Amino acid sequence: AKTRSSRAGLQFPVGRVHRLLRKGNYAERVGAGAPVYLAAVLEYLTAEILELAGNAARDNKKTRIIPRHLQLAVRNDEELNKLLGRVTIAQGGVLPNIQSVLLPK
């Protein structure tokens, strides 16, 4: 195979991410399978997030995926929103959640 991505079996851009690691001043020498490793990683994460995003879209009767679909997808999972807890959302919107006691007798 010519395309690097394919030699490592992936969709993520091997060499585009390599250059981005040199135009970001992060250091004097860039590693050889770092780039890939890193590409592949995000790849997973994207997937991870993008795997339920779709499921959320299934949930509400649509075949596409609008941003809230990313938002709910991230908040419910504890191991998802936990990391992004410092991320606020283009028109994120809100989980219906009403505190325990103001609900009525």
Binding site: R7, P13, Y37, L42, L50, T63, I65, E79, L83
Partner: protein, 93 residues
């Protein structure tokens, strides 16, 4: 002149997993933003560590720990695995 996007890379993988499904144009942009932030926190992480013990290299392990720390457990460990396999995949080839 040359507006970059990571839309191309999302575009395939989307279909690979949910082929009867699509992305909002802004939802994709959000994702573009997300990766880069995500690319930087890690890269940032990577760099600091290199420097700490004066390491004129970001190797394939410097990133690995970096992620390990940066990420909450269940997600972190899978990603660690995909990572080594890939090196496994690529070097002999």
């Amino acid at each position: 002149t040359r507006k970059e996007s990571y839309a191309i890379y999302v575009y395939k993988v989307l279909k690979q997993v949910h082929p009867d499904t699509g992305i909002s144009s802004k939802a994709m942009s959000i994702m573009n933003s997300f990766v880069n932030d995500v690319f930087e926190r890690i890269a940032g992480e990577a760099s600091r560590l290199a420097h700490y013990n004066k390491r004129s290299t970001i190797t394939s392990r410097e990133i690995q720990t970096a992620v390990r720390l940066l990420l909450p457990g269940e997600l972190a460990k899978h990603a660690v695995s995909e990572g080594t396999k890939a090196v496994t995949k690529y070097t002999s080839a």
